[PDB]
Structure formats: structure tokens, C-alpha cells
Amino acid sequence: MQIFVKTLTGKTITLEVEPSDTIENVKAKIQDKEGIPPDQQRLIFAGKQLEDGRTLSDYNIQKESTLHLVLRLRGGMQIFVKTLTGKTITLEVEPSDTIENVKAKIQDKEGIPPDQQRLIFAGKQLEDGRTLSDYNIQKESTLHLVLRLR
Amino acid sequence: RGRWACQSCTFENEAAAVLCSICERPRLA
Amino acid sequence: RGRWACQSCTFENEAAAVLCSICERPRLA
Amino acid sequence: RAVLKELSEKLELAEKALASKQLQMDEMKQTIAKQEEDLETMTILRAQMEVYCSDFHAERAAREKIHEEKEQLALQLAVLLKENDAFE
Amino acid sequence: DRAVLKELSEKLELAEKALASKQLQMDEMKQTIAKQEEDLETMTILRAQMEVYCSDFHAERAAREKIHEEKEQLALQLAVLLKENDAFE
Ligand SMILES: [Cl-]
Ligand SMILES: [Zn+2]
Ligand SMILES: [Zn+2]
């Protein structure tokens, strides 16, 4: 069922699901549709905020309608990034994030181009193509940012 | 039955009126 | 006069009715 | 005077007045519908406010946890200093 | 014909009762609009709370980053003392 949503500002690209998908699969179609991660979004339909573990047909999500959805201030996992100057910034991440995604997040916070960022963890240099999980980076882990001198 | 007194605003309306000329409420309201 | 059809719900009212028997809307509304 | 004409004219007047009153009720009925739309938006606002409340609590919990970790470190440090001064 | 007068008089009385009825209904609806507008005033307090909770979140995270910076210095001081003790093993 092609289903759209209304928000405070407005953002909706090609989307589509059917009531058979799980409560996490609906938040998945919003991933590529609304642009906010799944654990940062909480969905509500006519005053019923359906959680994960309840079929979307048990309380039929009407097809092809405009729903209101509210967004969280935080996700479920933050890591810290430390600048040489001592400043600490907090990143909302997911274990599947590559360290290249992490650098794109730093650019959004600090305006530094990812090309210019070197990241250190557990005494080792991090490689763009790997994921937080590959490095065993976990909630409240601390990365160290060094800028390239080149 | 003659003019009728509106029970909400007291204006005396003509026998042919069904609504009050001032407050527009019907005679029996 | 005569029977009249409600313009909203199509119920056919008797000539003596001033409101529709089902939806209560007046004949001319 | 012509009673039949007089009664007829008043009844026609009553039926026009009825239509008029009904059209006014239709306006108020639509207002009530808009207010019910706004009242639903107020419930959603209430939901958004509760999520922020929840996320506030979660962030506060995290801040308290790291604050407690910092304290246990301050103590470990204090133990090391008392031990180190014992040599001096 | 006397019945014709009875038809109109009876239908007119019916129309005038129907008018009082519609007016009393409108009166009730006016109160409904009034109560619902009163309920909507509760929105001002609701938005104020949302701004407070939203504001408190950012403050908590800011505090969390500062305590992190402090935790890091302490952790470093500790490591320096431990490696120094470690040298005599
Ligand atoms: Cl390079
Ligand atoms: Zn009056
Ligand atoms: Zn009808």
C-alpha cells in the first residue's frame, strides 16, 4: 500500500509497504523515506503508538493516508569524539555505521571535510570502509580526531 | 394573538414574524 | 404541498412534515 | 383579511427560516469539525512532548552514569595518591 | 375548507416548534464550541512543557560531554601512575 505521512516541515520520497510488514519494517521504509534512523523514530496512528512485536493488521494501518509521526531527540547508541583541543562531541551512531559514515557525521558537527579527518580508537588508526562493530566500538566508546597535515 | 414578546431580548415582534427582529431567535425558543 | 423528497438523504417525506423524518433537515435546506 | 393567504405566507416564512437556521448549524458543525481536528493535533503534541520527556530522562540517565564513572575514578586516583605518599 | 385552515395552522405550529428545536440545538452547539476552545487553551501549557523537556535534553548532553572530558583526564592521570608503578615489576 502506497502510504504517505505529514510532518512539521515535509519530506517524502517514493515509499511503499503493506500491513504485513513488522513494526520495525515500517520504520524501515521510513528509513529511506524520512531519513531518520529507526530507533530515533516513534510511529503513531490515530492515537495508538504501535511498538515492535505487533502485526500492522491487528490495528489496521489504513492504506494511502496522511499520518502524523513524532521524532526523538536521541537514538540508542552514542559515541564520543575527542578533538586534540579537548572538546568532546557526541554522535548518534549504529553498529553498522562505517567509519566513513562517522566522518560524515563529524563534518556535520564541526565543518571538517571527511578527507581531512583521521580517527583513532584503542590506540589504532581507523579505516573508512570498516564498521563500528568490526572495531568493537560500543556505546560511549571514545574516538580521537586528528586533522591531516599532508 | 397580536405582537409577541421575545423571551430572550424582550423585543415586541409583529404577529407575522417567526423570528425576533433583533436577536433572530424563534418565538418558541 | 404533497409528499416531498429530502434533498440530503432522499427519504420521501409526507406533506405534513417540515423536517425530514430521518435526517431532520428542513425541506428547503 | 385573507386568513388562508396570511397563514400560507407565514408558513412559507417559517420554512425559509428553517432552511436559514439549518445553514447556520452546518457552519457550526464544520467549526466543531475543525476544532476536533485541532484537538487531535493537541494529542499528537502531547505525544511529542512525552517523547521529549522520555529522551530527556534517557540522556539524564546517561549523564548520571558517566558522572558516577568519573567519581569512581577520582576515588581510585585518591587511593593511588595516599599509597604513593606512603613511600614519601 | 375549514380543514385546510387546520392543515396550515397545524403545519405552521409544527414549523415554529421545529424552529425552537433547531435554535436550542444551535445553543448547545455554541457551548460545545466554547468548551472545545477552552480545551485548546491547554495547548499553551503543552508546548511550554515540550520546550522545557527539549531544553533539558540538550543541557544534559552538554553536561555529559563535559563530564566525559573530565573522566578522560582522570583516566589519563590514573594510567600515568599505574605505568609508573608498573615499571618496578
Ligand atoms: Cl591521505
Ligand atoms: Zn429577541
Ligand atoms: Zn433526510
| Alpha-carbon span D63 to D57, nearest angstrom | 10
Cell numbers placing C3: 409528499
Q: Which of residues 25-84 of E touch A (CB under 8 A)?
A: 54, 57, 61, 64-66, 68-69, 72
Resolution in A: 1.8
Any idea what the Cα angle at residue A35 is, between residues A92 and A65, rounded to 5°? 135
Residues A90 and A50 in one domain: no
Statement to judge: residues A21 and A37 lie in one domain: yes
Helix (H, G, I), strand (E, B) or coil at A61: coil
Q: Measured between CA atoms, how close is E15 to chain C, in angstroms?
A: 6
Task: List the A66-71 sheet strands across, edge first.
Answer: A4-6, A66-71, A41-43
- Report the C-alpha gap between A76 and D54 in whole angstroms: 12
**Where are chain B's structural domains?**
1-29
Amino acid symbol at A49? Q
Cα–Cα distance, A133 to A34 (Å, whole number): 25
Q: How far is CA A72 from the centre of its chain?
A: 11
Provide the number of CB pairs (under 8 Å) joining chain D to chain E. Answer: 121
Count of CB pairs separated by less than 8 Å, A with D? 26
Integer Cα distance of A73 and E55 in angstroms:
11
Q: Which residues in chain C have Cβ-Cβ distances shorter than 8 Å to E18?
A: 18-19, 26
Find the closest chain E residue to A84 by CA distance: E69
- Return the number of other C-beta atoms located less than 10 Å from residue B15's C-beta: 11
DSSP structure class, residue C11: -
- Which residue of chain E is at minimal alpha-carbon distance from C20? E18
Looking at the structure, do residues A79 and A39 belong to the same domain, yes or no? no
Same domain, A127 and A79: yes
Residue type, A10: G
Q: Which helix (H) or strand (E) holds A91?
A: strand A88-92
How many other β-carbons are positioned within 10 Å of the β-carbon of residue B26? Answer: 25
Instruction: State whether C18 and E10 contact (CB < 8 Å).
Output: no
Helices E2-86 and D3-87 sit at what angle, rounded to 10 degrees? 10
- Is the CB of E7 less than 8 angstroms away from the CB of C26? no
Residues in chain D within 8 Å Cβ distance of B17: 13
Examine the fold and report which residue of A29, A53, A73 is the final residue of a domain before the chain moves on. A73
Our answer on whether C and B touch (3+ beta-carbon pairs < 8 Å) is no
* Three-class DSSP category at C19: strand
How many CB atoms lie under 10 A from the CB of residue A108?
10
**Partners of chain C (3+ Cβ pairs below 8 A):** D, E
**Nearest ligand, measured from the Cα of A114:** 1
Q: How many other CB atoms are found less than 10 A from the CB of residue A43?
A: 20
- Given A73, A100, A123, the domain boundary residue is A73
CA of A104 to the centre of ligand 1 (A): 16
Distances (CA, A) of A37 to A2, A11, A31, A42, A97: 21, 14, 6, 10, 11
Q: Which of E17, E67, E78 to mutate to test the interface with D (most CBs of D within 10 A)?
A: E67
Left if phi > 0, otherwise alpha if psi is -120 to 50, otherwise beta: which for E53?
alpha
After what residues is chain A interrupted, C–N > 2.5 A? none
Chain A residue with Cα closest to D43:
A47
CB B14 within 8 Å of CB B29? no
Do A99 and A145 reside in the same domain of the chain? yes
Same domain membership, residue A128 and residue A101: yes
| Helix or strand holding residue D25 (H, E) | helix D3-87
d(CA A91, CA D47): 25
A78 and A143 part of one domain: yes
Centre of ligand 1 from the C-alpha of residue A102, in Å: 17
Q: Alpha-carbon Rg of chain A, whole angstroms?
A: 19
B22 touches chain D (CB under 8 A): no
Q: Looking at the 3D structure of chain A, how many domains does it have?
A: 2
Cα separation values, E31 from A80, D46, E25, E39, Å: 56, 25, 10, 12
Q: Which CATH number does the domain housing residue A59 bear? A: 3.10.20.90
**What does the angle CA A44 – CA A24 – CA D40 come to, to the nearest 5 degrees?**
5
Q: How far apart are CA B10 and CA B23, in angstroms?
A: 10
Structural domain harbouring A79: 74-149
Minimal Cα distance from D11: which residue of B?
A: B18
Q: What is the dihedral of CA E71, A75, A99, E77, to 10 degrees?
A: 0
- Output phi, psi for E62, to 5 deg: -60, -45
Put simply, whether D19 touches C (Cβ < 8 Å) is: yes
- How is residue A118 annotated by DSSP? E
Contact status, residue A89 vs residue A144, Cβ threshold 8 Å = no
What gap in Å lies between CA D27 and CA D20, rounded to an integer?
A: 11
**Cβ contact, residue pair E15, C16, below 8 Å:** no
- Grid cell for residue A79: 559515541
Distances (CA, A) of A15 to A2, A33, A51, B4: 6, 6, 20, 66
Structure determination technique employed:
X-ray
Grid coordinates representing A88 are 568532546
Question: Do D39 and E36 touch, CB atoms closer than 8 A?
Answer: yes
Helix ranges (H only) for A89-139 are 99-110
Tell me if E65 and A73 make a contact (CB, 8 A cut-off).
no
* Residue type (1 letter), A88: T
Question: What is the nearest CA distance from D58 to chain A, expressed in angstroms?
Answer: 9
A41 phi and psi angles, rounded to 5 deg: -105, 140
DSSP annotation string for A22-52: -HHHHHHHTHHHH-S-GGGEEE-BTTB---S
SS3 A133: coil
Measured at the alpha carbon of residue E10, what is the angle toward residues E7 and E13, in degrees to the nearest 5?
Answer: 145
